Amino acid sequence: GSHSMRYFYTAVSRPGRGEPRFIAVGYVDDTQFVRFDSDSASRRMEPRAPWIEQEGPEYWDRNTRIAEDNAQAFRVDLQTALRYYNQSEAGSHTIQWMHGCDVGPDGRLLRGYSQLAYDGADYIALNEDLRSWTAADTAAQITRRKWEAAGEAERYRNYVEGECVEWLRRYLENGKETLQRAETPDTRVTRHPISDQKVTLRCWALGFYPAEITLTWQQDGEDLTQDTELVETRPAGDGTFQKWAAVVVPSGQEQRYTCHVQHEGLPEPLTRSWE
């Protein structure tokens, strides 16, 4: 029952087509609670969860300022990178930054992280100790030395150890209405005959939280080692998630096949067959 708080930042330069766009999204586990977008009508930080809109006006003001200040830093960060890599001023470019903290099942701090990327490629990451950096290339090493002189590692370490964790417990408690209870998946098995000899069995898992789930097919109660036809887990669009696994079986002997579902909301793994 580990919990996390995460912030995803995206800065995209668009030469000729105006100022660089800035997006920031806030996550507690798999729930998005806060949003910033430079192209948005309201240039401020916006609530996305029921338990976040509880917060006062100053909260929204400081968090707007925070993202707005980050917007400036990444604006020049894009300008610096063009020079580092001798890139043309004409092309679009991307910087990404994901930071955050995790708490343990007891409540105590488990992990902190701060990773960055230029044009999809790794650039600089704070080490697991929260004291050292790892640069990906020679340009990122110049960035590294500058950040070590500026004590950025020490300044983020204080935030994760102090503020980040403290706010996470707060959101969890205020959000235990939705956050601290896992939604158990609705599982069904459907039958689709392709021909008179064979038939597709589909294992549906719908309306679950969190996103993590394992669907495993079994014949005669024996596991299927090799890849099965399945889809990458997708959002239902209401906070819950969806996934299905499909196998081709001979018609008539559908009883010999069972779907084995592993999910956090389930105390014991759930077994499903064609009803």
Partner: peptide, 9 residues
């Protein structure tokens, strides 16, 4: 809440 990032590239 969010984290201010002062240093740049």
């Amino acid at each position: 809440n969010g984290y201010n990032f002062f240093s740049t590239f």
